[PDB]
Amino acid sequence: GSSGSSGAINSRHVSAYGPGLSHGMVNKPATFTIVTKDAGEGGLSLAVEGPSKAEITCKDNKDGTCTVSYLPTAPGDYSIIVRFDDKHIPGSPFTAKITGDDSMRSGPSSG
């Protein structure tokens, strides 16, 4: 290279950005984008720890990113744990705010 000297110690980093990360609502798949264009296929992990277990999907953009969507069951602050090669990323777990409220209801009229 020409007077490069651009081999810093920590360069490969991953950050999440999206609506599902900032906040969300019950019974709604929180969709967000994960910056993995630099990280590159490695040992990325995905987990959510909140007031309820919410499944997490994984998509292959085969371009330079990773799409994920989690469907919560209860309102509250969800913790999206995202580790990369046994190393927590700078921003995770991402505390996502989820709103929502349930209530009981009747059915029949005259039995």
Side-chain angles (χ1 to χ4, degrees):
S2 291
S3 298
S5 192
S6 297
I9 310 281
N10 282 114
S11 200
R12 299 291 205 193
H13 289 151
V14 178
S15 206
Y17 77 90
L21 301 162
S22 291
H23 68 273
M25 299 158 288
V26 179
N27 271 281
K28 304 286 288 198
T31 73
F32 59 102
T33 281
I34 310 172
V35 189
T36 60
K37 67 165 67 84
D38 311 320
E41 281 54 53
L44 196 87
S45 82
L46 288 153
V48 177
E49 276 281 63
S52 209
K53 172 193 211 190
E55 270 280 64
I56 317 157
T57 192
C58 177
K59 269 86 197 271
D60 270 78
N61 292 292
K62 279 202 197 87
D63 271 289
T65 58
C66 276
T67 295
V68 180
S69 328
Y70 82 74
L71 173 88
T73 309
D77 39 71
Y78 281 79
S79 297
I80 300 150
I81 301 153
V82 179
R83 308 184 204 190
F84 195 62
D85 207 47
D86 294 48
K87 300 172 77 69
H88 264 255
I89 66 161
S92 147
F94 285 95
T95 300
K97 210 193 77 80
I98 303 299
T99 57
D101 274 87
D102 188 81
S103 196
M104 71 271 180
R105 46 82 152 76
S106 278
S109 188
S110 71

